[PDB]
Design a protein around this ligand. Structure first.
Ligand code: NA
Length: 228
């Protein structure tokens, strides 16, 4: 009916290990497992619709999906959607080819060519700092890392964990994370502004998973995934 009305879950089709469509064409990842677990304790029915990230924010407001299982919090962002508490903290890192000159911080990236996720927290963050001219935008963080690997740019800034997972999966073995633990993010579910029902439905499920131990059980599965 209303509570039995299938909840449609949006997410990025290419953001491992948090969320991604796997080789078998199946929704997979930490977020997915978390969402399925929540659906189970809250008695919800969910449909996963993972897609290009450049349109999931829209689709939330557009109502094409009812919630996003994995999105980083930000002021500009809170002004249009409501976030539940976060289920994880996402650190970023600066990646470079091994040979290349190391950088100890993102200020050292001024004047250098830099790849990064199209409109992710770091895109916005480095734009607001005059980097925009010296930076290439990619559909996925992995595309950013491929360009770096291919000597197609000088550095890349992407979420640490996905970075490592991507380096392994796509065999970008000339890449190393040089500048680590910089710019931590609060990552979690989010629903359309003023949808306190759904919002509370998810927050409660998350809170429940944390008190029963299922949350940590799921998190321990995905190495490197941190908790708030
Ligand atoms: Na809000």
């Amino acid at each position: 009916r209303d509570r039995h009305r299938t909840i449609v879950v949006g997410g990025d089709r290419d953001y491992p290990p948090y969320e991604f469509i796997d080789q078998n064409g199946k929704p997979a990842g930490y977020n997915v497992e978390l969402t399925r677990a929540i659906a189970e304790v809250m008695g919800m029915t969910v449909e996963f619709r993972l897609g290009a990230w450049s349109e999931m924010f829209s689709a939330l407001k557009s109502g094409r999906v009812d919630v996003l299982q994995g999105i980083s919090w930000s002021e500009k962002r809170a002004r249009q959607i409501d976030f539940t508490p976060p289920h994880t903290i996402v650190y970023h890192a600066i990646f470079a080819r091994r040979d290349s000159p190391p950088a100890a911080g993102l200020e050292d990236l001024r004047g250098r060519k830099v790849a990064l996720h199209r409109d992710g927290i770091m895109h916005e963050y480095l734009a607001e700092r005059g980097y925009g001219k010296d930076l290439v935008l990619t559909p996925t963080p992995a595309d950013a890392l491929r360009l770096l690997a291919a000597g197609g740019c000088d550095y890349a800034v992407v979420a640490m964990v996905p970075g490592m997972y991507i380096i392994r999966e796509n065999r970008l073995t000339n890449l190393v994370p040089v500048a680590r633990s910089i710019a931590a993010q609060r990552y979690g579910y989010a629903v359309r502004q003023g949808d306190a029902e759904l919002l509370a439905r998810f927050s409660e499920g998350l809170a429940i998973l944390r008190k029963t131990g299922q949350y940590e059980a799921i998190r321990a599965k995905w190495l490197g995934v941190l908790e708030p």
